Structure formats: C-alpha cells, structure tokens
RNA sequence: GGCGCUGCUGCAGUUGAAACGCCCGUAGUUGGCCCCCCGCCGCCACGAGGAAACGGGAGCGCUCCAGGCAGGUUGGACCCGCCGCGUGGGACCGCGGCGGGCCCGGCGCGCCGCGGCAGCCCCGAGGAGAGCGGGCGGGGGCACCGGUACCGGCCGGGGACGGGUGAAACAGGAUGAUCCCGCCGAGACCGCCGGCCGCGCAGGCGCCUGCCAAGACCGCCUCUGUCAAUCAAGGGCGAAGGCCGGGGGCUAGAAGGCGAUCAGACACCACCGUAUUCCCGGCCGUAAACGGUGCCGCCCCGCGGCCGGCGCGCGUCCCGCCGGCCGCCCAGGGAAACCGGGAGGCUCCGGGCUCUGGGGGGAGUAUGGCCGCAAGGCUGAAACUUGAAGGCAUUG
C-alpha cells in the first residue's frame, strides 16, 4: 500500500517515523540544539547589555529610509548584536554606555520588514520602559 | 438473450480456454486404430508424443506434431 | 552557468583544495 | 501471489454491479466468503448464489439486484474491544442508521448490532452498505 | 589466520623495489610455482625445472613449454592452426 | 516542457538500442528509427534530353536506366530543406503520406 | 509458470478429469500396472516418463484412478526409490553441464548468469527436502563435489 | 492547536521535491484452498489482588461562586493502576498406533498376538518447480571466412591545372598531379533488404561456414506436493569516455598546428594531425543508464495491426484460445497536459513487500569513514541567507 502493514510491523512503523521527522525544518530547528547554541540569547525571552555605538541602517530594496539601531554587548556571554530602536525620536535616549534590555522582533530570530541584519530590539533603557519614555510617562534624569 | 451463467451452452463453452471453463476439464481423449497388416484395433492417446507401435510391427504408427499426433498410414476411429 | 560546467568547475576546486591540504 | 480472496471477491462484485450485470463469477471460494455472502443475503442486499465444485478451490456465482453502494475488507484484522465499535461506526459507515461492520467472534460471524446485543468483542473483517 | 592482506608471496621483498614491479611479480611467480596437469600422466603433477622445461613428477615425462607457464596462448593457437592445415591436406 | 508526442519523436518499440545512420546533408549521427527516410527512383539523364539520347542511340530497343536511392536526413536538415513541415497541434496526429 | 526467474507469465499446463475412475476399456489391475511400473523402473525410466509410457503404449490416463497411489509412492512401496529426488537430480545435472561448458568457454557471461540462477534453485530445493526429511540432515550441494555424485 | 506541512487512523513520488542502472540473495515482513467437537499460544468477556490525591461521578444552597465534605433518622456510594494471576468462549490466526489381558487402585516398565479397530495418503491452485514434443528468434561463446569502399604503393596512357568553400585561402602538380585501367598490402565495417519486425536480466544484439551449451512460449488425462512473494547485509553483470600491462594501427579524430571570418575569434567553417577508436588480461561502476512511471496478485466498454504456438471449420482462406509487442477510445481519474494492458476500481480513503521526498538557497559543499592505481564513487552536515522558487495552462 506504499506503506507497510500487517499485525507485526510496529517496530518498522516507528523506525520510519523517527527517521523522517528530521526532514521537517521546524522539528529539526527546535530539536537539534545547534540553534540553542547559535542563539545569542541562549534560549530566553530577553537579556541585557551595554550600548557600544549608535548606528543608522539603510532600508531594503523597495523602501527607502534610515532606521535607527545600537550595537549592544551582551552581559551574560560577551557577544555582539544589533538592536533596532523603534518609535520616532527615541534614538536620543540611548547614550554611549547604557544598560539596555533587549528582546525580539518575533519570528524566532528572523529579519522583519526592511531592516537588514537585525533580529533584536531594545525595550528598556537605564531601568525605564521605552514605550512610556516615548509616551511621556517617565523621564530619564538629565 | 437471457443467459444464466450457471447453466451455459456446451458448444460455446468448448470454444473457450480449458482452464477458464466453469468446471475445468481436459482437452485430450483416446481413439481406436485399425492396422493395415493385422485385424485388431488398438487404443491410442489423441496427443501421443512417445513412440506407438503395431503389435507385430517394428515400424512406428505415430508421429509427434506439437499438438495432435499423426500416424503412419493406418485407418482410425474415435471411441 | 550550465550545470555541467559548474560541476566541472567544482571538481577542479576540490582537486585544488586536496592538493593544498596534502602539503602538511 | 494472492492473499485476500475475499478482497478480490468484493471488488469483482462491485465492478459488476456498477456496470449493471445480473450475475458475476468469483474464484476461488472459501468458508469466510460463504459466511460474508450469507450475511449480505439475510440483510437483503443480494439474491441467490451457488458454489460450484471442481475437486479444487471452487467457483461461486452471485446474483445481483442493485442495492449495494459499497463493500470492502479491513486489512489487517485489527482487534476490537466491545467499546470501540462506535468509534469504528462513525469512521466507516455513512450514518448511524444503516450499514454493517462485520466481526468474527467466538460466538459466530456476526454484524455490530448483534456484537453489542451480546456486548462482546472480536476482530473486524469487512464492511458493507 | 591470514598473515598478509595484499602482498601475498611478494612479502619476501619487504619495502623494496616499488609497487608496479611487485604487482607484476605476484602474477609471474604464482604462475611459475603452480602445479599443472600432465597431458599424458592424466594427473596434476607437472612442475617447472628450468625456464622452458617441465617434468611430471608421477609419470616422469619431460616437456618443452613456456618460461613461466606450461602452455602459452600463441602455442595453443599455432597448434590448432597446424592441425587444421594438416586435416585440409587430407583429401 | 510537457510531453509533445506519444512516440517521443521516434519509432522504437520493445528494445533498448537501435543502429546509427549518418545524415546525408550534414553528416550528423542519428538513430535509425528517428531518421527521416525517403526512396527516390529517377532516370540518370533529364527527361528534357531523354528524347535526344533515345533518338541518337544505335541499339534497337534500348531503354533508359533508372536509379534507386534512399535518402536519409536528420530533423534539422529535413525541416530546413522542407522535407517535413512544422504542423498544427491537430495536424500532428495525421500519418497520411 | 516460467515466472520465478524471468518475466515469463505463461499458463500452459495440464487439466485432469473431474471424474476419478478407470476407463470402460481398462482391464489391467493394480497388480499388473505395478508390474509394468517396476519393469520400467528397473530398465531405468524416470517417474515423469513412466507416466508418459503408460499413457501412450498402455492407454491409462491416470495411475491413481486405477490403483489408488502415485507412481513415486509405488516405487517406494516396492522399494525402488532413488536416493536423490528426480527434479533435484535434473537441476544438478544441468548445473554440471553448464559448469563443463564453461570449463572450455571462459568468456561466456550469459552462461555464468544462467549458472547462478540454476544453483540458487538447487539450494532452495535442498533446503525444502532437508527440512521435510526426504534427505539427510547433512545433505549439501557443492559444485566441486557434484559431478561424480550422479553415478550413485 | 491551526497541520492530512510527519499522515496507524490519513500525505506525496510521469512533468511541481521524490521509484535504487539491473539480476541473485540472508535477517525481517508476508503467504491460496481444505478436516471439528483434542492440546498449546494470540484474541474477547467476566473476575481476584493492590494508594490516596488528581480526573470523572451520586447526595449536600460555604447568601451565589472558585470550593469543601458537609449536614437535619444521617451521609462521604461508585469508576479509573494491569502485556502478570483465575473462570468461560473458541469463529479468526499459527504449531502438533491403537485395544485387551499379565496387572495389581491408578501411572510408568516390560510382557505375549492375544484380533478387538475400515488400522495408518484430502486434493492436485488460471501458485511454483521438473519433464516430453513442436516449432521460434539481429539471445550468448569459440574457430573460420566473403564483399565493395576509405588509405597506401607499383605498370602503363595522356598532357594543365587539381583540391576546398556560402565565397575563398593553406596543403597538391611538367620530380607529369587531378583523370582511366590493371596488380599488390593492411585494418576497420557489415549497406539496399531493415520494419508501430524480433530476441536478452538490463547494458545491448545484423558477413559465410562449423561447433557448444542455453531460453521464454505453446501443446500435454506426465512427475512432485507449498517447495512461494518481496527483500537490509552480501554476491554477480553493467553504454560511452578513462586507467594499468601486452599487441595492432586503415578511417575518423579530444590536444597541438595552420587558412579564413571578425572589432576581437584563442570558436563555429577549410586543411594536417597525437592520445582514442580495434584485439587480449584486468580495473573503474557512472548516463535524459527514460516509459523521467518499482515488484507479485485480482477486476476491467470496445474497435483494429503485427509476431510465435495451437485447435475447429468450409474450399489458401476463416473463426476462435494462450503468450508478446503496438494504435485509437466509452466510463472512471486528474491542477491540467494527458492516462486508460492504468495514471482506473481512493476523503465512499485499509491485498502483500522494498526504496525515496518534505519552500528556495548555502551544497552534494566542509568534515569523518569505506572503496579506487588515479580520475572518482558511496555515505553527507552546520552556521547564515531569502518571499518566494516551481508545475500545467490562457491572451498578447
Ligand atoms: K505513496
Ligand atoms: K504514503
Ligand atoms: K515503504
Ligand atoms: K501476519
Ligand atoms: K515517510
Ligand atoms: K477448444
Ligand atoms: K477463454
Ligand atoms: K485451448
Ligand atoms: K489448451
Ligand atoms: K487440444
Ligand atoms: K502434445
Ligand atoms: K545535471
Ligand atoms: K549537469
Ligand atoms: K558531467
Ligand atoms: K516545465
Ligand atoms: K527522440
Ligand atoms: K514493435
Ligand atoms: K523493436
Ligand atoms: K531494433
Ligand atoms: K521517415
Ligand atoms: K537534428
Ligand atoms: K521473477
Ligand atoms: K498470464
Ligand atoms: K540460494
Ligand atoms: K543419484
Ligand atoms: K502539525
Ligand atoms: K487532525
Ligand atoms: K500516494
Ligand atoms: K521539467
Ligand atoms: K533532486
Ligand atoms: K528502482
Ligand atoms: K535506496
Ligand atoms: K536487488
Ligand atoms: K531477488
Ligand atoms: K529470492
Ligand atoms: K522470518
Ligand atoms: K516490515
Ligand atoms: K511473518
Ligand atoms: K506475501
Ligand atoms: K486476549
Ligand atoms: K471472541
Ligand atoms: K494510601
Ligand atoms: K498469560
Ligand atoms: K487461563
Ligand atoms: K482461559
Ligand atoms: K532458431
Ligand atoms: K538467431
Ligand atoms: K536476418
Ligand atoms: K542468434
Ligand atoms: K561470437
Ligand atoms: K558467433
Ligand atoms: K575482396
Ligand atoms: K576484405
Ligand atoms: K532481415
Ligand atoms: K521481420
Ligand atoms: K528479418
Ligand atoms: K530477430
Ligand atoms: K526477426
Ligand atoms: K518473429
Ligand atoms: K530482425
Ligand atoms: K524466496
Ligand atoms: K529474506
Ligand atoms: K529483489
Ligand atoms: K541490496
Ligand atoms: K548491496
Ligand atoms: K562488473
Ligand atoms: K562491465
Ligand atoms: K562503461
Ligand atoms: K581509454
Ligand atoms: K589507426
Ligand atoms: K578523448
Ligand atoms: K572561444
Ligand atoms: K562560441
Ligand atoms: K585530416
Ligand atoms: K584516452
Ligand atoms: K592507438
Ligand atoms: K573515442
Ligand atoms: K580502431
Ligand atoms: K567502464
Ligand atoms: K544516479
Ligand atoms: K537523474
Ligand atoms: K527516453
Ligand atoms: K523496488
Ligand atoms: K503472425
Ligand atoms: K500469429
Ligand atoms: K516472437
Ligand atoms: K506465427
Ligand atoms: K501463428
Ligand atoms: K495469433
Ligand atoms: K489471450
Ligand atoms: K495474452
Ligand atoms: K512470451
Ligand atoms: K498499445
Ligand atoms: K503489452
Ligand atoms: K509479498
Ligand atoms: K527495492
Ligand atoms: K528510491
Ligand atoms: K531514490
Ligand atoms: K532520493
Ligand atoms: K521516506
Ligand atoms: K574531509
Ligand atoms: K588506493
Ligand atoms: K593512472
Ligand atoms: K588519491
Ligand atoms: K583521491
Ligand atoms: K513556474
Ligand atoms: K522545476
Ligand atoms: K524550472
Ligand atoms: K489548466
Ligand atoms: K497555471
Ligand atoms: Mg510470457
Ligand atoms: Mg498533523
Ligand atoms: Mg573502420
Ligand atoms: Mg561484480
Ligand atoms: Mg585522416
Ligand atoms: Mg590522419
Ligand atoms: Mg577509450
Ligand atoms: Mg536513470
Ligand atoms: Mg508488433
Ligand atoms: Mg573522508
Ligand atoms: Mg491554469
């Protein structure tokens, strides 16, 4: 029947499934551990670091713009990442040595939109949420 | 016409292949022969492919032909 | 390229790498 | 090589009916096919059949009356507890009101309604409706 | 238990003389050490005594043959052709 | 590239390999069951001079010798010289000579 | 038939009468047909040909109908059975013949192909007879040993 | 979870990703029909025995409720551990000399025929193997052998150009070419006939004569008695090119050389030419090795053609049967092109077995291993990157 059958083939019906699961990119991506290694966050929702430089990023082929980002040095493992600073005007609140908190764009570490090479974003600067900081709910000291 | 497949026609069933009749049967049979030089009649296979003789004769009265067999100059019957 | 000739190119490259590793 | 003489019988019959034949010949026969045609008959989906003899595996001649949407076998004969019959009913039969799953049990070849009337289990053979 | 993997009887040479020569000698020396069937004796007892000289150790015939095998292919073909040419000279 | 012909462009039925023939126009190698083949029979003098030859012969009852030559071409040469034409999708199924 | 080791798919075979009884012309008795069977067995005719001989010269289509047993069982009953069974003997014989042809022809790969097929059938049949106890538990086919076993 | 994009239920494999180049073959998986009322497994039911809590579930107005076990003679019932143990079934699925008396409660162990038992064989598959007869065929191996042509040489005749191309130019020629005719040498090749012909496991297969063993099909009231199907590992074969060692060397001809063309032309076209093309002994193991379609088995509206064997008929024909190769085609199938001897009998899904795929790239690459003289082959990732790639079809 293009599949094996018969009452005494359970071992083969299990061997086939075990071998063919790895041909799915999602099962392999979530069960092989090489991504758990290559992941800058080491499998967490967020991580902190200090800002090392402010940069601008030229948008991808259809659009045209200069998005805003920061080069971040992670505290927990001493790695280099880039984080897109959202929400118009916020790039002023990111000084040259700040403790920033970094989370994702979604899509489990895939680029989003037209911003090339960035898979992370900053959500807190110096203990303050950047949403409220934009929305004038809290203010950085001086 | 309204034919029942469980009581078919013998003449049309015989035209068929022998394994594909309703009740499988043989094709061969047996037949009597009369000798030129002696009186008695002997019984022979319809598809003989081994030598067959004439009780006195040291000559052969049968020839293989791949199917039904021939006989060197005798005079036959069917029974 | 025509895949035939990409294949000929790749074979020459692998031959070059193998000669290179053979030293040391 | 041939494995399921009953599978081949049922396919032959459904082809013949789909054309619109009055009879059909299936070979070989066996005990199980005789049982299965008998259940088909007392449920009232087919007319006469006759088993004709050749000192061998026999032949069967079946009479058809245009009622049989489908008939088939389940290979392998999985084992069934008394409480899985309905999870097979809503899988194989078009409705809960007509159709038949066929079980072999230590108290005969029978359909599902009887297998529950006696609330026993068995191993499934086929289905028809 | 098997004692070498490939060299066979050329293991007597050690690491000397290179691969191609040792490959040729394995074949040659196996052929010249082999026992052959005596075309008279009926038995497989013919051994070489010098380059083209073969003696049956059972029936004691001596025969002239090849350098490293008892028969050669040119001699097989020549003997067949000479036999045919004789037979054609018989009318 | 779906399939264009049921015969795959050749007449090869129940075998693995068939012989090779050279094309007469360009000398390309073509398998025998694919090559385009024709047979011609023609006199060795044109008929516009066959009458003059036949009047000026001496042999009483002499006849003009014929010629029997089988031409075989590849597909390219056949189409280019118009032995065969590219056809409509319907017309491709016609085998009439 | 002709299907185990090629793409044959033929059906030519014999089909025997439904009715099981001797002929109206049968005057022989199990005694005398056994007489003929055993004279032929001594003379050296194999069981597959003994049936041909009594079908043709003696005019009996089936032997069990007249007697009640099968020709090889008659041979066993009166004590004239071969040590090796008949079709295994025929297969070994053909294997010997092809080996001997290859002793002169070294470049005949088609013959070597056929040799493999024949010997695979020989091993499979030897396994059946041996586990079925028609042949010693130590029985084996060896090409090198085979050629002289036929005389015995 | 959506996801039948992991598919036991229940995916896909002609062209979108995907059937191993083929044959043999062990483990594994699977295996026709038959006797019923015995034994041993599997299976089905019902029990026994062991934990609550959780999950269900009977009863109860913490005012309801998430709860809790309360409460007004009471109550907190009952279910739910299991490939083990017990009782019963026995359809399906496997596997398998006797009495009597000596003899005596049994049971063994022997003892005598001591006649009591019908003493002790399903059948012979539109499974398979074996046989006999008959024809059949570019199926295979070894020897031998004809024929023109291409190339080379020699005798003679005759006297100006010959070759080559789209057109030309480099090669050739009064040391007489090109052309005609006779003679000699060598190595390839096997035309027309030659095919919707045929054979082989595939790769493949075409001169004459001889020899050698095979093969499928048909015909058959011959033999046997399931001896089978498919197959990891393992073994054999395998176009062309390529490699090692011997031989041979006509044609053509990778490389190399040279005349043109051109902007360039190191290419296409012309000319010369080495390996190679041929034989013997090995090796290598790949092709759009293609029907882009795995093998065994069943059912299947019809009309034709050719090839092999058989039988009935009239007087070569004609009707049938088995096997093969092909065309067209109702139904049905499908995204369609198309298939239709299946790619049908499938969301109405389950005959058996083996292999392969899971968006496009990176990549058949890196790395390790096995094999190979080498050229390679076989096995074969990850990081990272991307919104599509792709099928069949319509109009321009
Ligand atoms: K499939
Ligand atoms: K599938
Ligand atoms: K499978
Ligand atoms: K099973
Ligand atoms: K799978
Ligand atoms: K007939
Ligand atoms: K028929
Ligand atoms: K017939
Ligand atoms: K027949
Ligand atoms: K007949
Ligand atoms: K016959
Ligand atoms: K390719
Ligand atoms: K390629
Ligand atoms: K290539
Ligand atoms: K395409
Ligand atoms: K083609
Ligand atoms: K054909
Ligand atoms: K052909
Ligand atoms: K051909
Ligand atoms: K043509
Ligand atoms: K062409
Ligand atoms: K086969
Ligand atoms: K068949
Ligand atoms: K074997
Ligand atoms: K013997
Ligand atoms: K899913
Ligand atoms: K689901
Ligand atoms: K499928
Ligand atoms: K394509
Ligand atoms: K691929
Ligand atoms: K394959
Ligand atoms: K594979
Ligand atoms: K295989
Ligand atoms: K096999
Ligand atoms: K096998
Ligand atoms: K097994
Ligand atoms: K299995
Ligand atoms: K099994
Ligand atoms: K099977
Ligand atoms: K059970
Ligand atoms: K039961
Ligand atoms: K407890
Ligand atoms: K148990
Ligand atoms: K029990
Ligand atoms: K029990
Ligand atoms: K022939
Ligand atoms: K032939
Ligand atoms: K011919
Ligand atoms: K031949
Ligand atoms: K040959
Ligand atoms: K030959
Ligand atoms: K000649
Ligand atoms: K010649
Ligand atoms: K011919
Ligand atoms: K022909
Ligand atoms: K021919
Ligand atoms: K042929
Ligand atoms: K032919
Ligand atoms: K033919
Ligand atoms: K032919
Ligand atoms: K087998
Ligand atoms: K196996
Ligand atoms: K196989
Ligand atoms: K294999
Ligand atoms: K293998
Ligand atoms: K090989
Ligand atoms: K090869
Ligand atoms: K090759
Ligand atoms: K080469
Ligand atoms: K040459
Ligand atoms: K080359
Ligand atoms: K170029
Ligand atoms: K070019
Ligand atoms: K040249
Ligand atoms: K070369
Ligand atoms: K050469
Ligand atoms: K070549
Ligand atoms: K050559
Ligand atoms: K090769
Ligand atoms: K391949
Ligand atoms: K391919
Ligand atoms: K093809
Ligand atoms: K396969
Ligand atoms: K014909
Ligand atoms: K014919
Ligand atoms: K034929
Ligand atoms: K014919
Ligand atoms: K014919
Ligand atoms: K015919
Ligand atoms: K037929
Ligand atoms: K047929
Ligand atoms: K055939
Ligand atoms: K066809
Ligand atoms: K066919
Ligand atoms: K199977
Ligand atoms: K396979
Ligand atoms: K595969
Ligand atoms: K594959
Ligand atoms: K694959
Ligand atoms: K798979
Ligand atoms: K490596
Ligand atoms: K090596
Ligand atoms: K080399
Ligand atoms: K190397
Ligand atoms: K290497
Ligand atoms: K596309
Ligand atoms: K594609
Ligand atoms: K494409
Ligand atoms: K379309
Ligand atoms: K489309
Ligand atoms: Mg066939
Ligand atoms: Mg799912
Ligand atoms: Mg040549
Ligand atoms: Mg091999
Ligand atoms: Mg040349
Ligand atoms: Mg040259
Ligand atoms: Mg070569
Ligand atoms: Mg291929
Ligand atoms: Mg044909
Ligand atoms: Mg390696
Ligand atoms: Mg479309």
Automatic annotation (TrEMBL), chain A:
<protein>
    <submittedName>
        <fullName>Ribosomal protein S23</fullName>
    </submittedName>
</protein>
<comment type="similarity">
    <text>Belongs to the universal ribosomal protein uS12 family.</text>
</comment>
<dbReference type="InterPro" id="IPR012340">
    <property type="entry name" value="NA-bd_OB-fold"/>
</dbReference>
<dbReference type="GO" id="GO:0022627">
    <property type="term" value="C:cytosolic small ribosomal subunit"/>
</dbReference>
<dbReference type="GO" id="GO:0003735">
    <property type="term" value="F:structural constituent of ribosome"/>
</dbReference>
<dbReference type="GO" id="GO:0005840">
    <property type="term" value="C:ribosome"/>
</dbReference>
<keyword id="KW-0689">Ribosomal protein</keyword>
<dbReference type="InterPro" id="IPR005680">
    <property type="entry name" value="Ribosomal_uS12_euk/arc"/>
</dbReference>
<dbReference type="InterPro" id="IPR006032">
    <property type="entry name" value="Ribosomal_uS12"/>
</dbReference>
<dbReference type="GO" id="GO:0006412">
    <property type="term" value="P:translation"/>
</dbReference>
<keyword id="KW-0687">Ribonucleoprotein</keyword>
<dbReference type="Pfam" id="PF00164">
    <property type="entry name" value="Ribosom_S12_S23"/>
</dbReference>
UniProtKB/TrEMBL annotation, chain E:
<dbReference type="InterPro" id="IPR002674">
    <property type="entry name" value="Ribosomal_eL43"/>
</dbReference>
<dbReference type="GO" id="GO:0003735">
    <property type="term" value="F:structural constituent of ribosome"/>
</dbReference>
<dbReference type="GO" id="GO:1990904">
    <property type="term" value="C:ribonucleoprotein complex"/>
</dbReference>
<dbReference type="InterPro" id="IPR011332">
    <property type="entry name" value="Ribosomal_zn-bd"/>
</dbReference>
<dbReference type="Pfam" id="PF01780">
    <property type="entry name" value="Ribosomal_L37ae"/>
</dbReference>
<comment type="similarity">
    <text>Belongs to the eukaryotic ribosomal protein eL43 family.</text>
</comment>
<feature type="disulfide bond">
    <location>
        <begin position="56"/>
        <end position="59"/>
    </location>
</feature>
<feature type="disulfide bond">
    <location>
        <begin position="38"/>
        <end position="59"/>
    </location>
</feature>
<feature type="disulfide bond">
    <location>
        <begin position="38"/>
        <end position="41"/>
    </location>
</feature>
<dbReference type="GO" id="GO:0006412">
    <property type="term" value="P:translation"/>
</dbReference>
<feature type="disulfide bond">
    <location>
        <begin position="41"/>
        <end position="59"/>
    </location>
</feature>
<feature type="disulfide bond">
    <location>
        <begin position="38"/>
        <end position="56"/>
    </location>
</feature>
TrEMBL record, chain F:
<comment type="similarity">
    <text>Belongs to the eukaryotic ribosomal protein eS26 family.</text>
</comment>
<feature type="disulfide bond">
    <location>
        <begin position="23"/>
        <end position="26"/>
    </location>
</feature>
<feature type="disulfide bond">
    <location>
        <begin position="26"/>
        <end position="77"/>
    </location>
</feature>
<feature type="disulfide bond">
    <location>
        <begin position="74"/>
        <end position="77"/>
    </location>
</feature>
<dbReference type="GO" id="GO:0003729">
    <property type="term" value="F:mRNA binding"/>
</dbReference>
<keyword id="KW-0479">Metal-binding</keyword>
<dbReference type="InterPro" id="IPR038551">
    <property type="entry name" value="Ribosomal_eS26_sf"/>
</dbReference>
<keyword id="KW-0687">Ribonucleoprotein</keyword>
<feature type="binding site">
    <location>
        <position position="25"/>
    </location>
    <ligand>
        <name>Zn(2+) 2</name>
    </ligand>
</feature>
<dbReference type="Pfam" id="PF01283">
    <property type="entry name" value="Ribosomal_S26e"/>
</dbReference>
<dbReference type="GO" id="GO:0022627">
    <property type="term" value="C:cytosolic small ribosomal subunit"/>
</dbReference>
<feature type="disulfide bond">
    <location>
        <begin position="26"/>
        <end position="74"/>
    </location>
</feature>
Automatic annotation (TrEMBL), chain G:
<dbReference type="GO" id="GO:0070181">
    <property type="term" value="F:small ribosomal subunit rRNA binding"/>
</dbReference>
<dbReference type="InterPro" id="IPR023029">
    <property type="entry name" value="Ribosomal_uS15_arc_euk"/>
</dbReference>
<dbReference type="InterPro" id="IPR000589">
    <property type="entry name" value="Ribosomal_uS15"/>
</dbReference>
<keyword id="KW-0479">Metal-binding</keyword>
<dbReference type="GO" id="GO:0003735">
    <property type="term" value="F:structural constituent of ribosome"/>
</dbReference>
<dbReference type="InterPro" id="IPR009068">
    <property type="entry name" value="uS15_NS1_RNA-bd_sf"/>
</dbReference>
<dbReference type="Pfam" id="PF08069">
    <property type="entry name" value="Ribosomal_S13_N"/>
</dbReference>
<feature type="binding site">
    <location>
        <position position="8"/>
    </location>
    <ligand>
        <name>Mg(2+)</name>
    </ligand>
</feature>
<comment type="similarity">
    <text>Belongs to the universal ribosomal protein uS15 family.</text>
</comment>
<dbReference type="GO" id="GO:0005730">
    <property type="term" value="C:nucleolus"/>
</dbReference>
<keyword id="KW-0689">Ribosomal protein</keyword>
<protein>
    <submittedName>
        <fullName>Ribosomal protein S13</fullName>
    </submittedName>
</protein>
């Amino acid at each position: 029947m293009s599949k094996t059958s018969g009452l005494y083939t359970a071992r083969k019906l299990r061997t086939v499934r075990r071998v063919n699961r790895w041909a799915d990119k999602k099962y392999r991506k979530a069960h092989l551990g090489t991504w758990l290694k290559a992941n800058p966050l080491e499998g967490a929702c967020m991580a902190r670091g200090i800002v090392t430089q402010k940069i601008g990023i030229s948008a991808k082929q259809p659009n045209s713009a200069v998005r805003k980002a920061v080069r971040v040095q992670l505290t927990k493992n001493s790695k280099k990442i880039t984080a897109f600073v959202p929400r118009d005007g916020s790039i002023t609140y990111i000084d040259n040595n700040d403790e920033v908190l970094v989370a994702g764009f979604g899509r489990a570490g895939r680029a989003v939109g037209d911003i090339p090479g960035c898979r992370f974003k900053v959500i807190k600067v110096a203990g303050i949420g950047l949403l409220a900081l934009f929305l004038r709910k809290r203010e950085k000291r001086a | 016409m309204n034919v029942d497949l469980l009581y078919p026609d013998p003449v049309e069933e015989q035209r068929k292949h022998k394994l594909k009749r309703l009740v499988q049967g043989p094709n061969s049979y047996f037949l009597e022969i009369k000798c030129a030089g002696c009186q008695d009649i002997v019984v022979v296979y319809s598809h003989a492919n081994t030598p067959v003789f004439c009780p006195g004769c040291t000559s052969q009265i049968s020839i293989p032909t791949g199917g039904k067999c021939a006989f060197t100059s005798q005079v036959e019957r069917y029974r | 390229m025509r895949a035939k000739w990409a294949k000929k190119r790749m074979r020459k490259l692998k031959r070059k790498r193998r000669h290179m590793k053979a030293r040391s | 090589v041939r494995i399921n003489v009953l599978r081949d019988a049922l396919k032959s019959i459904c082809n013949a009916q789909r054309i619109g034949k009055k009879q059909v010949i299936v070979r070989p026969s066996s005990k199980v096919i005789i049982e299965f045609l008998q259940l088909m008959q007392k449920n009232g989906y087919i007319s006469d059949f006759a088993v004709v003899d050749n000192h061998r595996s026999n032949r069967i001649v079946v009479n058809l009356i245009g009622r049989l949407n489908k008939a088939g076998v389940i290979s392998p004969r999985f084992d069934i507890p008394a409480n899985d019959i309905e999870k097979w009913v809503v899988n194989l039969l078009p409705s809960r009101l007509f159709g038949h799953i066929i079980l072999t049990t230590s108290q005969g070849i029978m359909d599902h309604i009887e297998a529950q009337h006696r609330q026993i289990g068995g191993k499934v053979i086929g289905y028809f409706y | 238990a098997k004692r070498t993997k490939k060299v066979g009887l050329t293991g007597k040479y050690g690491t000397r003389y290179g691969r191609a020569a040792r490959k040729q000698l394995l074949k040659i020396e196996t052929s010249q050490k082999a026992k052959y069937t005596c075309p008279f004796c009926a038995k497989d007892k013919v051994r070489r005594t010098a380059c083209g000289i073969w003696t049956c150790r059972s029936c004691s015939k001596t025969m002239a043959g090849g350098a490293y095998s008892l028969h050669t292919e040119p001699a097989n073909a020549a003997r067949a052709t000479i036999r045919r040419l004789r037979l054609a000279r018989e009318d | 590239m779906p399939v264009k012909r049921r015969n795959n462009g050749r007449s090869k039925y129940n075998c693995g390999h068939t012989n090779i023939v050279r094309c007469q126009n360009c000398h390309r190698c073509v398998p025998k069951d694919k090559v385009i083949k024709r047979f011609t029979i023609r006199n060795i003098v044109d008929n516009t001079i066959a009458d003059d030859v036949l009047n000026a012969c001496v042999i009483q009852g002499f006849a003009i010798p014929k010629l029997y030559n089988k031409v075989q071409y590849c597909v390219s040469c056949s189409i280019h010289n118009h032995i065969v034409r590219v056809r409509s999708r319907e017309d491709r199924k016609i085998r009439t000579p | 038939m002709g299907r185990m080791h090629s793409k044959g798919k033929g059906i030519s075979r014999s089909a025997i009468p439904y009715t099981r009884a001797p002929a109206p012309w049968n005057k022989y008795t199990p005694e005398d047909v056994c007489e003929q069977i055993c004279k032929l067995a001594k003379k050296g005719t194999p069981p597959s040909r003994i049936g041909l001989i009594l079908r043709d010269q003696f005019a009996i289509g089936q032997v069990k109908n007249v007697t009640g047993s099968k020709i090889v069982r008659i041979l066993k009953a009166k004590g004239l059975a071969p040590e090796i069974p008949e079709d295994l003997y025929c297969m070994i014989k053909k294997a010997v013949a092809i080996r001997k042809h290859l002793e002169r022809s070294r470049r005949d790969k088609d013959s070597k192909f056929r040799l493999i097929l024949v010997e695979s059938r020989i091993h499979r049949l030897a396994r059946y007879y041996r586990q079925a106890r028609r042949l010693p538990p130590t029985f084996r086919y060896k090409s090198d040993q085979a050629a002289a076993l036929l005389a015995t």
